[PDB]
Amino acid sequence: ANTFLEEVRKGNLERECVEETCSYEEAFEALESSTATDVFWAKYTACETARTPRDKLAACLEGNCAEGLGTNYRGHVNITRSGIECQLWRSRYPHKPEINSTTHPGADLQENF
C-alpha cells in the first residue's frame, strides 16, 4: 500500500494487503489469478466489517467463523438452529432459493453447508 518505495519489490499478499490497506490491485500483483483473487475480493467485501485490526482480518481470511449475520461464513455446518439438515444450495430441492450460488457466490455457498 503506502511507502511507495515498497511498490518496487515483490510484495507478499500479507505484507501489502492486510496490516496496511490494499485494493484489488496490489493483491492481484501478489497472486496473479482472478479466481482465488476474487475469492479474496469476496472475503474483502465481506471483511468490510473486518478491515481493522490485524487479527480481525487474519481470522476473516481464515474462514472458521461467521461475522454476525454470517456473510463471511465459509465453514461447513450442515445443521440449522434446530439442527435440521440443509438442502442443496445450488439446486431448488425442496424449496426454491431466491438468492443462490448463481446469484451470490461471494458468500461461497457449498452443497448444503
Q: Restricting to residues 18-77, which ones interact with Ca ion according to CB under 5 A? A: 20, 26, 29
CA atoms in the 13 A half-sphere facing the CB of 11: 26
Is the CB of residue 67 less than 8 Å from the CB of residue 42? no
Q: Write the DSSP string, 64-103.
A: -S--TTTTT--S---B-TT-PBPPPSSS-SSS--SS-TTT
Tell which one of 19, 31, 38, 106 touches another protein (CB under 8 A): 38
Which among 1-9, 48-56, 67-75, 76-84 is the span making contact with Ca ion, rule CB under 5 A?
A: 1-9
Contact of residue 52 among another protein, Ca ion, none (CB under 5-8 Å per partner type):
another protein
Tell which one of 36, 53, 65, 66 touches another protein (CB under 8 A): 53
Binding region for another protein (CB under 8 A): 2-5, 7-10, 25, 28-29, 34, 38, 51-53
